Amino acid sequence: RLGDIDFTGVSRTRGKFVRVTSSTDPAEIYQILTKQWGLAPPHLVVALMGGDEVAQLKPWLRDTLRKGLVKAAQSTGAWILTSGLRFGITKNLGQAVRDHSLASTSPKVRVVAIGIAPWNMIQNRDLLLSAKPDHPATYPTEDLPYGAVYSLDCNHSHFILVDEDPKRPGATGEMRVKMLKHISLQRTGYGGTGSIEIPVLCLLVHGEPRILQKMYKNIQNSIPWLILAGSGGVADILVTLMDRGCWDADIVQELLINTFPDGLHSTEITSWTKLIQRILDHGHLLTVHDPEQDSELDTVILKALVKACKSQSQEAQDFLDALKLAVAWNRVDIAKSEIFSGDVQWSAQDLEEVMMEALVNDKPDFVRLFVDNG
Amino acid sequence: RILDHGHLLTVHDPEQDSELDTVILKALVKACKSQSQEAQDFLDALKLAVAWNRVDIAKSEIFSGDVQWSAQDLEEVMMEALVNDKPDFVRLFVDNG
Amino acid sequence: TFQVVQENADIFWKFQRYNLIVEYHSRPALAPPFIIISHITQALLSFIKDLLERELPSGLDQKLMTWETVQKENYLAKLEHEHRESSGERL
Looking at residue A123, what DSSP letter applies? Predict the structure, then answer.
């Protein structure tokens, strides 16, 4: 069921949406996103996995995060997967995406804020139940309180509304995980000639213990994660344990109890402890972003992606996909530090396509680097 | 018994710091913070920090993680910063909800 | 006086040129003594019944406002960055 939404409020904007069930194949959803709605295959997918809690980020940290994310996404064509609900970090991030879209003089690269929200958490769903192809449904925007129901953000251009699964109350999370896994196995460009595998990345902002299962499932699907240093929720636990260097059951139990005193369930605490241990067992898929120190989100994104790929395999072909990504963002220093450091042998035939991409994309630093490297 | 308190004691070294107002504000906020952790207690200290246009001291001490600050909490302090020609505190309060 | 004035005289000429061009925008296309035809036509049209200073649709106006805000943010960020990389601040 596909329909268009005409938001009514301060700014009149038109947005698309589709109702989808938990039994749907993600291939169909990706196909309709790419073709039916005319969205080009993204060069970068960033998924927000938090910010819906009662506690919110500081306005300075929120603004830094939104500015860094938009700046990193504007280099190429990026998708920002969030819950299409006007609340928390999602509202401000969608507003920043919309502001960048209006102010972008080059429509060649587009930052699209996709919204995946549960159907039962939609305010005035009957208003959009019409979905007349000739007349798009009119939807009013209201800043509801925390509660348990929100209104769709008008700044998200496209939506993926998922119905609740009668089996388990995790339909939206499973759908998000499946969509991320399916997107991670696609090609960046229209054809598989000079196109790379789509880099899918997840961002954590003040997670709750309920999302640990979904985070571990994503890690099992082998997609990198970025953790905010000063987020507030599970992000603090993860960054503290990684700073400590080693994780033990007592330490993580104590930290989880201190950060979430309201959570008092022995089985739940043990399950969360096991989930955290298995999550940290990977490590190469985990990365810390500290806006106070680095504040360069694109640098952290590239470092996380190349770290994940390098941990995956040592073949030079694996780095070549990462090398193209490093070229695309004109981060020659990151490429020199990570890809071109001793271990990886690089033949002339290997660098032919990458040299073409650097030459035709007006990146002279990479041209010099490739000439200097055989 | 005097040193048992400690939070009420502060050292001023004119050779090193020589900024008496900074030491005074630090001592006052330290005493109040040791007294209680309620945000209302810091609000009286926040107004004092505003009055001396010491935005750095306020950011270091009052606005560091521990103390939750609601919009209704900052209304009067925002008024004081706005009407007293302190723009740094206006920026800080706008950035803080 | 010539040496002191020339630079300000150029700017003043540009400022005056704005007003003169605005003035020629509304002027009838027929030079006098012909201009009487234009005046009669204008009076008759008034009795019977602007490239500059234009009004834009709501969507375009909002887009331009957001674009100007983005440009202002970029300009302020550039100023802050150039101040941060200054020799004095580095020292």
Answer: T
Provide the shortest C-alpha distance from residue B90 to chain A (in Å).
13
Asked if C71 is an interface residue toward chain A (Cβ–Cβ < 8 A), one would say yes
Using the Cβ of C69 and the Cβ atoms of chain A, whether some distance falls under 8 Å is answered with yes
What is the torsion angle, in degrees rounded to the nearest 10, for the CA atoms of residue A149, residue A154, residue A158 and residue A164? 10
Cβ(A49)–Cβ(A214) under 8 Å?
yes
Handedness of CA A83, A89, A93, A96 (dihedral sign): positive
Check the annotation: does C80 bind a ligand.
no
User: Contact B24/B57 with Cβ under 8 angstroms?
Assistant: no
A8 close to A138: Cβ distance less than 8 angstroms: yes
Pairwise CA distance, residues A93 & A50, whole Å = 12
Which neighbouring-strand residues pair with A226? Answer: A203, A287
- Left (φ > 0), alpha (ψ -120 to 50) or beta: where does B69 sit? beta
Neighboring chain B residues of A59 at a CB cutoff of 8 Å: 94-97
State the count of interchain CB pairs (< 8 A) between A and B: 11
Q: How far apart are CA A260 and CA A240, in angstroms?
A: 15
Chains C and B touch (3+ CB pairs under 8 A): no
Q: Is A245 left (phi over 0), alpha (psi -120 to 50) or beta?
A: left
Chains near B with 3+ CB pairs less than 8 A apart are A
Chain B contacts of A230, Cβ < 8 Å? 65
Cβ–Cβ below 8 Å for A102 and C62: yes
* Residue closest to A81 by CA, chosen among A190, A226, A201, A219: A201
Q: In Å, how far is B85's CA from the nearest CA of chain A?
A: 22
Q: Does C81 touch chain A (CB under 8 A)?
A: no
Can you read off the two tokens belonging to residue A51?
């910010």
Q: Which residues 6+ apart lie within 8 Å of A316 measured at CB?
A: A344, A345, A346, A350
Q: Are strands A137-140 and A2-8 parallel, antiparallel or unpaired?
A: parallel
Technique employed here was cryo-EM
Strand-pairing partners, residue A19, are A161
- Report the C-alpha gap between A234 and C50 in whole angstroms: 60
Q: Is A312 left (phi over 0), alpha (psi -120 to 50) or beta?
A: alpha
The bridge status of strand A14-20 relative to strand A2-8 is: antiparallel
